[PDB]
A and B are shown apart, each in its own frame.
Chain A
Amino acid sequence: PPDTVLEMGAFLHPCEGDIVCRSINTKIPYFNAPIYLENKTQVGKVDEILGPLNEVFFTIKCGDGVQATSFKEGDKFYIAADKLLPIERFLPKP
């Protein structure tokens, strides 16, 4: 596991076995980027990035033994620093 992980998302609700998170990070995650806790333990990987620019959500593909119903609202999910890329890339260039 990486030494430095940054808080990425906050729990919103489960959806079809996946975890929906409102992004509490300014940057956009890499596809299939692993999702951690404060204990540096992986709960899953980023499955889908969705939502408007002001309010970004992402759904996590839960791993083996990780259940979406086990988590409660207000739980924070963490991502590695190198797995974030700036939002200016997806916007069209001037």
Chain B
Amino acid sequence: EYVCIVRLHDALKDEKDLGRSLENLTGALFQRPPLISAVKRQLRVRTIYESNLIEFDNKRN
């Protein structure tokens, strides 16, 4: 389990879309490991079982 802060590069026109995007990323997912990780970077499927958006500040992004 993780609690994560995402920083957006620009302010969203619609706030709720962020939560909707998070609801799109719940389930089986196509992910590639980042460059920093020591694991070899090949495309895998990883399951996010449940996600919840705690807070969002569109001014603080």
Contact = CB atoms under 8 A, between A and B. Distances in A.
Given A51-B24, A52-B24, A56-B30, 9 more contacts: A16-B9, A52-B27, A52-B29, A52-B30, A53-B28, A53-B29, A54-B27, A90-B30, A90-B43
Contacts of A33: none
| Contact size range, A | 10 to 19
Chain B interface category by residue count: 10 to 19
The binding surface of chain B is classed by DSSP as strand
12 contacts: A48-B32, A49-B30, A50-B31, A51-B25, A51-B30, A52-B24, A52-B30, A54-B27, A55-B24, A56-B30, A90-B30, A92-B45
B44 interface: yes
